[PDB]
Design an enzyme around this catalytic site. Structure first.
Site, PDB file in Angstrom:
ATOM      1  N   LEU A  17      -3.714 -12.274  -7.045  1.00 21.88           N
ATOM      2  CA  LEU A  17      -2.488 -11.520  -6.670  1.00 21.88           C
ATOM      3  C   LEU A  17      -2.323 -11.069  -5.376  1.00 21.88           C
ATOM      4  O   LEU A  17      -1.157 -10.460  -5.096  1.00 21.88           O
ATOM      5  CB  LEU A  17      -2.511 -10.166  -7.811  1.00 21.88           C
ATOM      6  N   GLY A  18      -3.031 -11.622  -4.350  1.00 22.72           N
ATOM      7  CA  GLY A  18      -2.917 -11.096  -2.990  1.00 22.72           C
ATOM      8  C   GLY A  18      -4.398 -10.809  -2.542  1.00 22.72           C
ATOM      9  O   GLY A  18      -5.292 -10.387  -3.312  1.00 22.72           O
ATOM     10  N   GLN A  19      -4.801 -11.127  -1.306  1.00 23.15           N
ATOM     11  CA  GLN A  19      -6.005 -11.117  -0.701  1.00 23.15           C
ATOM     12  C   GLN A  19      -5.764 -10.598   0.542  1.00 23.15           C
ATOM     13  O   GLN A  19      -4.945 -10.327   1.121  1.00 23.15           O
ATOM     14  CB  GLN A  19      -6.740 -12.372  -0.816  1.00 23.15           C
ATOM     15  N   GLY A  20      -6.969 -10.140   1.285  1.00 23.94           N
ATOM     16  CA  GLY A  20      -7.132  -9.815   2.676  1.00 23.94           C
ATOM     17  C   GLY A  20      -8.371 -10.138   3.352  1.00 23.94           C
ATOM     18  O   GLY A  20      -8.753 -11.307   2.927  1.00 23.94           O
ATOM     19  N   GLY A  21     -11.640  -8.019   0.915  1.00 23.05           N
ATOM     20  CA  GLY A  21     -11.775  -9.136  -0.275  1.00 23.05           C
ATOM     21  C   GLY A  21     -10.328  -9.600  -0.740  1.00 23.05           C
ATOM     22  O   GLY A  21      -9.269  -9.363  -0.009  1.00 23.05           O
ATOM     23  N   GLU A  22     -10.362 -10.070  -1.970  1.00 23.16           N
ATOM     24  CA  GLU A  22      -9.110 -10.459  -2.713  1.00 23.16           C
ATOM     25  C   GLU A  22      -9.022  -9.659  -3.746  1.00 23.16           C
ATOM     26  O   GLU A  22      -9.905  -8.749  -4.203  1.00 23.16           O
ATOM     27  CB  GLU A  22      -9.400 -11.866  -3.055  1.00 23.16           C
ATOM     28  N   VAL A  23      -7.769  -9.755  -4.563  1.00 26.75           N
ATOM     29  CA  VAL A  23      -7.425  -9.107  -5.953  1.00 26.75           C
ATOM     30  C   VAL A  23      -7.237  -9.797  -6.765  1.00 26.75           C
ATOM     31  O   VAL A  23      -6.326 -10.974  -6.580  1.00 26.75           O
ATOM     32  CB  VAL A  23      -6.398  -8.246  -5.661  1.00 26.75           C
ATOM     33  N   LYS A  37     -10.623  -5.787  -8.038  1.00 22.87           N
ATOM     34  CA  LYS A  37     -10.804  -5.821  -6.610  1.00 22.87           C
ATOM     35  C   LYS A  37     -12.066  -5.858  -6.341  1.00 22.87           C
ATOM     36  O   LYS A  37     -13.138  -5.525  -6.603  1.00 22.87           O
ATOM     37  CB  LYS A  37     -10.452  -4.278  -6.053  1.00 22.87           C
ATOM     38  N   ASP A 128      -3.493   7.496   3.143  1.00 22.54           N
ATOM     39  CA  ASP A 128      -2.733   6.197   3.245  1.00 22.54           C
ATOM     40  C   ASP A 128      -1.714   6.064   2.280  1.00 22.54           C
ATOM     41  O   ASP A 128      -1.689   5.387   1.474  1.00 22.54           O
ATOM     42  CB  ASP A 128      -3.356   4.851   3.158  1.00 22.54           C
TER      43      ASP A 128
HETATM   44  C1  LIG Z   1      -7.654  -3.450  -7.642  1.00 22.81           C
HETATM   45  C2  LIG Z   1      -6.753  -2.393  -7.065  1.00 22.81           C
HETATM   46  N1  LIG Z   1      -5.478  -3.177  -6.696  1.00 22.81           N
HETATM   47  C3  LIG Z   1      -5.218  -3.385  -5.424  1.00 22.81           C
HETATM   48  C4  LIG Z   1      -3.888  -2.919  -4.685  1.00 22.81           C
HETATM   49  C5  LIG Z   1      -3.271  -3.931  -4.442  1.00 22.81           C
HETATM   50  C6  LIG Z   1      -1.825  -3.439  -3.599  1.00 22.81           C
HETATM   51  C7  LIG Z   1      -1.518  -2.035  -3.621  1.00 22.81           C
HETATM   52  C8  LIG Z   1      -2.391  -1.120  -3.916  1.00 22.81           C
HETATM   53  F1  LIG Z   1      -2.275   0.158  -3.920  1.00 22.81           F
HETATM   54  C9  LIG Z   1      -3.672  -1.641  -4.587  1.00 22.81           C
HETATM   55  C10 LIG Z   1      -4.709  -0.639  -4.864  1.00 22.81           C
HETATM   56  N2  LIG Z   1      -5.281   0.088  -5.555  1.00 22.81           N
HETATM   57  O1  LIG Z   1      -3.266  -5.270  -4.605  1.00 22.81           O
HETATM   58  C11 LIG Z   1      -2.509  -6.254  -4.183  1.00 22.81           C
HETATM   59  C12 LIG Z   1      -2.967  -6.936  -3.198  1.00 22.81           C
HETATM   60  C13 LIG Z   1      -1.870  -7.080  -5.284  1.00 22.81           C
HETATM   61  N3  LIG Z   1      -2.454  -6.212  -6.390  1.00 22.81           N
HETATM   62  C14 LIG Z   1      -1.328  -6.184  -7.734  1.00 22.81           C
HETATM   63  O2  LIG Z   1      -0.145  -6.600  -7.374  1.00 22.81           O
HETATM   64  C15 LIG Z   1      -1.802  -5.234  -8.780  1.00 22.81           C
HETATM   65  C16 LIG Z   1      -0.994  -5.423  -9.959  1.00 22.81           C
HETATM   66  N4  LIG Z   1      -0.101  -6.229 -10.133  1.00 22.81           N
HETATM   67  N5  LIG Z   1      -1.483  -4.342 -10.572  1.00 22.81           N
HETATM   68  N6  LIG Z   1      -2.941  -3.631  -9.810  1.00 22.81           N
HETATM   69  C17 LIG Z   1      -3.816  -2.781 -10.059  1.00 22.81           C
HETATM   70  C18 LIG Z   1      -4.814  -2.612  -9.012  1.00 22.81           C
HETATM   71  C19 LIG Z   1      -4.566  -3.475  -7.753  1.00 22.81           C
HETATM   72  N7  LIG Z   1      -3.503  -4.220  -7.562  1.00 22.81           N
HETATM   73  C20 LIG Z   1      -2.844  -4.576  -8.426  1.00 22.81           C
END
Ligand SMILES: CCN1Cc2c(ccc(F)c2C#N)O[C@@H](C)CNC(=O)c2c(N)nn3ccc1nc23
Length: 264
Positions: A17-20, A21-23, A37, A128
């Site tokens: 769903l997006g990365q920088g 690690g990855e998600v 994460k 943040d």
């Molecule tokens: C594993 C934790 N993170 C990463 C995360 C993000 C974006 C904004 C955030 F504050 C966090 C945080 N903390 O990730 C982004 C790269 C993409 N993540 C998502 O779209 C996402 C989702 N649809 N449910 N969900 C639940 C948790 C989660 N990310 C998601």
């Protein structure tokens, strides 16, 4: 090892769903939709990567993204709940943005202020706080997230209070400032605060007493709340308990005669 330690194979990563690690959006013990994460080894320090999980173990609230489990053996994993609507920034900028109005947007702000008032009672600072770190699920539910910098008490400049961006004074009222910037994000539907200004120009003008003007179609009674969040002296800023109470009763106590506009 804690009781958050799960097997490294109990997760079935699927969609990124997006990365920088990855998600990743995967599976837990067979049936649980989760968000994983991960620490892609950039040889990054796992003690600096499990620090985000250390704070996430002590914070449980319905308006905070709920950590599900941790894997603390290389490669590192962090399992949290899955938000079906993604980040709030993409939501305000997406196809649903143009349809959101002040009653819904204030509601999202009251949920953020509710979760930000929870950790205000726990004596933590988030450090943040921004709409890019707020995550949305179904039913317009917003849970604050990204505790990779949160820590117990003792830069993305445009969202940071001056004393924290300048003197490192990250306190409970340094995030109240970021909440006021979050209100400009919600009222403009994802726009960047201080349009046309660079980070250094924002630091210079904010230290000179400059504050963002009223967003178009935004009631002055809500921009007043932003200025209270942007008070120079950190103790003049309102508490998140006041912020959550203000935004929950907004359309009865503050703006009972609210009429919808083309945008808000
Ligand atoms: C594993 C934790 N993170 C990463 C995360 C993000 C974006 C904004 C955030 F504050 C966090 C945080 N903390 O990730 C982004 C790269 C993409 N993540 C998502 O779209 C996402 C989702 N649809 N449910 N969900 C639940 C948790 C989660 N990310 C998601």
């Amino acid at each position: 090892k804690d009781a958050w330690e799960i097997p490294r194979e109990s997760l079935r990563l699927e969609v990124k769903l997006g990365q920088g690690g990855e998600v990743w959006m995967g599976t837990w013990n067979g049936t649980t939709r989760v968000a994983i994460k991960t620490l892609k080894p950039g040889t990054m320090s796992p003690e600096a990567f499990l620090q985000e999980a250390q704070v996430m173990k002590k914070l449980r609230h319905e308006k905070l993204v709920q950590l599900y489990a941790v894997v603390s053996e290389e490669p590192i994993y962090i399992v949290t709940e899955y938000m079906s609507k993604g980040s709030l920034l993409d939501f305000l900028k997406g196809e649903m943005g143009k349809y959101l109005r002040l009653p819904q947007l204030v509601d999202m702000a009251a949920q953020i202020a509710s979760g930000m008032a929870y950790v205000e009672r726990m004596n933590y600072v988030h450090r943040d706080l921004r709409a890019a770190n707020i995550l949305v699920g179904e039913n317009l539910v917003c849970k604050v997230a990204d505790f990779g910098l949160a820590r117990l008490i003792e830069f993305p400049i445009k969202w940071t209070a001056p004393e924290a961006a300048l003197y490192g004074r990250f306190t409970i009222k340094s995030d109240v400032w970021s909440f006021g910037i979050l209100l400009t994000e919600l009222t403009t539907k994802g726009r960047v605060p201080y349009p046309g200004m660079v980070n250094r120009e924002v630091l210079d003008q904010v230290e000179r007493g400059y504050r963002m003007p009223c967003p178009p179609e935004c009631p002055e009674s809500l921009h007043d709340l932003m200025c209270q969040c942007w008070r120079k002296d950190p103790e003049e800023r309102p508490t998140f308990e006041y912020l959550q109470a203000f935004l929950e009763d907004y359309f009865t106590s503050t703006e009972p005669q609210y009429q919808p506009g083309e945008n808000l």
